[PDB]
Ligand binder design. Structure first.
Ligand SMILES: *Cc1ccc(-c2ccc(C)cn2)nc1
Ligand SMILES: [Ca+2]
Ligand SMILES: [Cl-]
Length: 269
């Protein structure tokens, strides 16, 4: 039996699916700890930039979980992603510990731009800026990648890098009441929010687990971007980003929520 995690319903992905929009034909890179083989995922390819971890399999769990929020398969098992037909790529930039370097993340972004990705999900960040990272965000953006990044989990009224950069779409986390999760960073540069509390997704060992974080919010938006791209194949990264913001549901101040809650139904109407 398949179940639909509450956040998938909250962002109204099923309404898009009913219109025939699944993310088919859209390439989404998950720049994370890898993605493990799983019966509810279809991993099309990828690359590793973590020395000593040449495989793109996930030794942590984080990247597998993120991937399932984007693209868990629509079938009779497991869960269901926002964009269940997205072409999913495992871009390992963080090791099994859950950390990497700005160099590995940059290499993943360059890979995305050189390999035709439409969306890059970066459920990662730091409080400090990085020239290396910024350059790679900008390069990927120039190559047509929509970079979607987590605002961070410190609870502060400023957001992490690379989410803070103008060419990243920064995503904060909401709870089931449509309030900002306590940990969700906010402030200047925040673009949008999505569900990030008690988010069930795919997990290594062919299982499912629930997690909290802006890392869980981010893939809802990456998936919504893929739905928008399938509907509007001619659109650029900027056009998709703007449309997601313009069609989001206001939840309160732009400072706490950016444009508000992503709405895949409104974005694909
Ligand atoms: C052994 C093991 C199994 C599951 C997990 C886990 C589940 C959920 C989240 C959010 C993080 N980690 N860790 C270790
Ligand atoms: Ca499924
Ligand atoms: Cl490996």
């Amino acid at each position: 039996a398949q179940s639909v995690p509450w956040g998938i319903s909250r962002v109204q992905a099923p309404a898009a699916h009913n219109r025939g929009l699944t993310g088919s034909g859209v390439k989404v890179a998950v720049l994370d700890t890898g993605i493990s083989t799983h019966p509810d995922l279809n991993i099309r390819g990828g690359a590793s930039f973590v020395p000593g971890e040449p495989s793109t399999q996930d030794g942590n769990g984080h990247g597998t979980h993120v991937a399932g929020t984007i693209a868990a398969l629509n079938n009779s098992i497991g869960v269901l992603g926002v964009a269940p037909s997205a072409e999913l790529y495992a871009v390992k930039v963080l090791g099994a510990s859950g950390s990497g370097s700005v160099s590995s993340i940059a290499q993943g972004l360059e890979w995305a731009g050189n390999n035709g990705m439409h969306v890059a999900n970066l459920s990662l960040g730091s409080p400090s800026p990085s020239a290396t990272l910024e350059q790679a965000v900008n390069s990927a953006t120039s190559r047509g990648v929509l970079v979607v990044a987590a605002s961070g989990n410190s609870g502060a009224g400023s957001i992490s890098y690379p989410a803070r950069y103008a060419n990243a779409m920064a995503v904060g986390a909401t709870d089931q009441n449509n309030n900002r999760a306590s940990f969700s960073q906010y402030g200047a540069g925040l673009d949008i929010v999505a569900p990030g509390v008690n988010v069930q997704s795919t997990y290594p060992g062919s299982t499912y687990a629930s997690c909290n974080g802006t890392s869980m919010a981010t893939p809802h938006v990456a998936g919504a971007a893929a739905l928008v791209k399938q509907k509007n194949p001619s659109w650029s990264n900027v056009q998709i980003r703007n449309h997601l913001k313009n069609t989001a549901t206001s939840l309160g101040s732009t400072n706490l929520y950016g444009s508000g809650l992503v709405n895949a139904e409104a974005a694909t109407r």
